Amino acid sequence: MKIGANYTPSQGWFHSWLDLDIDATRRDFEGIAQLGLDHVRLFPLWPLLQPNRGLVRPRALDDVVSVVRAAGEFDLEVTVDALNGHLSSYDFLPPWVITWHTSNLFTDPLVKAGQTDLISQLATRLREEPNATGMTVGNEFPQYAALAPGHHHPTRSECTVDDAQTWLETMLGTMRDQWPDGRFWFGFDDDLWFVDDHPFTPRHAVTQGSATTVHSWVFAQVGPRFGEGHPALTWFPRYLLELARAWSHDPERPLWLQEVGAPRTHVPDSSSAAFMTTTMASLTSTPGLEAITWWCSHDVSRDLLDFPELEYSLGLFTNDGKPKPEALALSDMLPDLHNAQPQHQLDEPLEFSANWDTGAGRSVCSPMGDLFAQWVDQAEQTGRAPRLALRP
Amino acid sequence: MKIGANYTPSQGWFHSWLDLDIDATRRDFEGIAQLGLDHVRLFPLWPLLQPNRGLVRPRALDDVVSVVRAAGEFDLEVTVDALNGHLSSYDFLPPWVITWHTSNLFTDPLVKAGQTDLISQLATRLREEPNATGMTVGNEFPQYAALAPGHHHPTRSECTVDDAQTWLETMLGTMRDQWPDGRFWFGFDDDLWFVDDHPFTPRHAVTQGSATTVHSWVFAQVGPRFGEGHPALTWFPRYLLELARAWSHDPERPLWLQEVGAPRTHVPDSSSAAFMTTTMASLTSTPGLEAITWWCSHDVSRDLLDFPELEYSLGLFTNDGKPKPEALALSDMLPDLHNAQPQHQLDEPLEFSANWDTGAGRSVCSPMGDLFAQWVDQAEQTGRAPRLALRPTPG
């Protein structure tokens, strides 16, 4: 199994793209490579790549490639998220899609034409770099359709289920057309798993792109319900992956745990190492799991304001570049993770019913319901991750 | 009076701040100064200056100073709009003020603290350039409070009349604290003159900052009502300036026609020279008028998409730098404009009733109303710009 990090530049965070300092980048990647990690996930900014729909900036693309080549110096494999878009509570949107220029980020024909232009130019650059493996359409881009009572986007783009599929096929198809050897994905917060009317569905997750992705974040629901120190905190990503496996009709469908982390809302600094060890140990046996990518590489500088406070301390390194206790715990897990001892599950899968075409009824799997509490209870008592099963 | 241009970079428009090519900037400013123009208005981009509330980028400030000094090489006076903010239908907003981070651009205490920080660092840099004269708060920044039926901002910030005053006093106060020798202004679209419940009022306009500013655009209302070729199109800026004079209780209050232009919705290319000369002739006698600034210096490149189409052709120059017919017409008017022969107006001012404290009733002055129609009628009949007079309503 591959083990890597979501790259959050220590100097400048993603605002570093405006004043790119490749030697500072190299010091970040040296640290990541020193831990034993083998890949990073990169996040270029949409307003810098494409400040007007007809202006895809060549120097912005040059900057992306410089960072790709810096990672290659330290033998780090790279994937790039194309449309960011959304990062750590902030939306990076070019002026031609906001306020007076509002349209629909999933169905407006000119917006889609701009998105495919940017994605095509990115893919044409990235296919030439030997350590670049592929692209994700954008970081949790489906949140621009979020409509849940506790998480609904303030300038939401209306979108049907079929609209969502057509948008994915357009973006992923453009990547494939320009970069046939690449692998391509989309990623999303867990509204896709848990919100019945969310237009991006589990069907989309297990059928579009090269692997099913999961982002696993316990601070919104799992932590509030179950609390600090509870086992559900460390079983959550395995649960999400078993849910992804339950939804798939293909036993060969690979999985990528593209985001997982330890929010200090419910995992104190002094529990972080143990959280890293317990979480990682419960993932090694996951069938089909190709990679785990930690959020994030480096603490966000406290000189940057207005983040939700949990975002600042998600790094494996402090902002000054010092490895944190969970960083060393991760290095120790790398042999077990690389080898990934399969365990063939002979359990009785916990069943749930939910609609394939529409995603209706998927809220039965929510961390607030009985099914997840029962899953965690059985995983703790047996020590073995239960399978899940979607009634046919 | 002074005559200048709102600077719209030919190579890349305002997106040129990301890839600043000072030799391209020199080429634009050379054309502007060759015409006889003596100043420019500059628009730095808020997301570039302050991508995070805690990060005012010194390299972005350096780039602003570089353009100020490039204009000094052609003896061009400079003012800088601090918070942009709004430019030609586009909003340039840092991520920390939008969507999940939405607050209030006029009343949120942390937003204001961020705004004053940026304004202070800008003022501190600009006060050391000899050709920099002052700053405007931001281009038409009150449009973030717009609430009119035909013009309401889709993510508007709720704001009272007193909120508006407090915000201006905070921003303008910061500029004066850091740059005592400077002159400072705010500018606005004509909602301030014409929309009864717009929280920025004519009272604010004639009392805050160093001079009353006017932006004069005929495409939204004057053109549609009166049509191509009508005299109302060329009288409109003088009307607005006489309205500004009427609201002011101070005869010494200066005026700045900070934006005026010739939109092709109602002024064809082949009418632009005549529009320029007629408009400018009706302005030379305006009491207190210190400067006129044309929107804009250079046509927007058609390689840039999704602009309202009228925005592309507002330049004095084509995008590749050829002077347009109105540019040469303006160059001829320059002796008459520098000399600015005053005229004592001995007329009976046309009266209107509106509220000084709240701005209520100011819509009687709208280009859709009878007052503006009679003003134009009398101006055409006599050849003299009529004065206006405010009768303050009780409350």
Numbering used by the authors:
A (entry chain B): 1 to 392
B (entry chain A): 1 to 395
Paper text:
The gram-positive bacterium Cutibacterium acnes (formerly Propionibacterium acnes) belongs to the phylum Actinobacteria, and is one of the major inhabitants of the sebaceous follicles of the human skin. In this work, we propose a degradation pathway for the cytoplasmic path of host N-glycans by C. acnes, as well as a detailed structural and functional characterization of the exo-β-1,4-mannosidase, a member of glycoside hydrolase family 5 subfamily 18 (GH5_18), that catalyzes hydrolysis of the β-1,4-glycosidic bond between the second N-acetylglucosamine and the first mannose residue in the canonical eukaryotic N-glycan core. The amino-acid sequences of exo-acting β-mannosidases (EC 3.2.1.25) are found in any of the three GH families 1, 2 and 5, which belong to the GH-A clan that features the (β/α)8 TIM-barrel fold. These enzymes follow a retaining reaction mechanism according to the classical Koshland double-displacement mechanism where two conserved glutamate residues act as acid/base catalyst and nucleophile.
The crystal structure of CaMan5_18 was determined and refined in the unliganded state at a final resolution of 1.8 Å. The crystals belong to space group P21 with four molecules in the asymmetric unit, and an approximate solvent content of 50%. The overall structure displays the, for GH5 enzymes typical, (β/α)8 TIM-barrel fold. The enzyme was co-crystallized with mannose, however, no clear density for the sugar could be identified. Furthermore, we were unsuccessful in capturing a complex of CaMan5_18 with mannose, probably because a disordered MOPS molecule is present in the active site of the crystal structure. Although the experimental data do not show bound ligand in the active site, we can derive from close homologs that Glu140 is acting as the acid/base catalyst and Glu259 as a nucleophile. The conformation of Glu140 is supported by interactions with His215, and the neighboring Asn139 is kept in position through a possible hydrogen bond with Arg41. The orientation of the catalytic nucleophile Glu259 can be stabilized through interactions with Arg41 and Trp217. The enzyme is present as a two-fold symmetrical homodimer in the crystal, featuring an extensive dimer interface generated by five loop regions: L1 (residues 46–57), L2 (residues 89–92), L3 (residues 98–102), L4 (residues 152–156), and L5 (residues 299–314), where especially L2 and L3 shape and stabilize the active site (inset). The C-terminus in our CaMan5_18 structure (residues 396–408) is flexible and lacks interpretable electron density.
